[PDB]
Amino acid sequence: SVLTKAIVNADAEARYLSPGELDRIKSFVASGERRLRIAQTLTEARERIVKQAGDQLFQKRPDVVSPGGNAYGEKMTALCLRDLDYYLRLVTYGIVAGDVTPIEEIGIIGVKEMYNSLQTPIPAVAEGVRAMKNVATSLLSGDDAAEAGFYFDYLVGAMQ
């Protein structure tokens, strides 16, 4: 969260929270109500977002849904969608927290190593997240979509 990050920086400096750091906390608490609304919207539309994003991803990369590809077969295709759902859930948590710390601990640390064992291609995963962003953006208001975009972009950046 924003709070966690601020405290951690202060602890390292061994200081009480700076006026600037306090101001950042104030801004976050003001924004919180809007953030909660954005998260709720995405939660409601989750099933649709995952499904639509999956389709776009499979259109972008035929290979993943092909005999060679990892996604090939019903079970595998489901698992690939399950993963997209997991990432969407993480994004919602991120939006309410105001930071990617929640996202990062659950999903971005060790992700390369996990996917490499599975043999899933990381760039395709990133494409799926990009796809999810496009679907999500359409449902969201323009201002809301920008906020949501940052968190989606972070995921894409973290695994590419």
């Binding site: 999903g107 640390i109 060790g110 992700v111 996990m114 064992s117 043999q119």
Partner: protein, 161 residues
């Protein structure tokens, strides 16, 4: 660590005895086995990543552990589990070359139970994963090699449990 050859030497050194025929026979036994072990070790090293993948598929993944709340849930924990698997495989290979289980006790087994208990890692599942690796390894190495390979895997599993 200690190997078969050194183990004989050490036993004679505490006695202060010069090496004798009986001792020589034990040493001779290791030397015949040795060539086979070297071949097995090379097989394992080349197929190491695959061995871990197969073993995870057999036991760890598609399970409650991977599902949310499970200790292998989250990428961080998944990655740590496959890292530990790799360690066990590497050390078992070292033990098989050495022909001695001692190295496993000194480097792998010492403190492992206590660490796992504090972490909350489930020992039984880990043991299961080691057993899975052994089966996969057995296939790759071939039967003669497999018997030798199996004892070290079994030694790890018994230590953890």
């Amino acid at each position: 660590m200690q190997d078969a050859i050194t183990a004989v030497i050490n036993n004679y050194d505490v006695q202060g005895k010069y090496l004798d025929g009986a001792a020589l026979d034990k040493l001779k036994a290791y030397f015949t086995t040795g060539a086979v072990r070297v071949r097995a070790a090379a097989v394992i090293s080349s197929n190491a990543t695959t061995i871990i993948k197969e073993a995870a598929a057999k036991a760890l993944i598609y399970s409650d552990l991977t599902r949310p709340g499970g200790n292998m849930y989250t990428t961080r924990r998944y990655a740590a589990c496959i890292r530990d698997m790799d360690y066990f495989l590497r050390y078992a290979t070292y033990a098989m070359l050495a022909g001695d289980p001692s190295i496993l006790d000194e480097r792998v087994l010492n403190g492992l139970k206590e660490t796992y208990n504090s972490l909350g890692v489930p020992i039984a599942a880990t043991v299961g994963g080691i057993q899975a690796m052994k089966e996969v390894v057995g296939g790759l190495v071939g039967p003669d090699a497999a018997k030798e390979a199996s004892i070290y895997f079994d030694y790890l599993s018994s230590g953890l449990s």
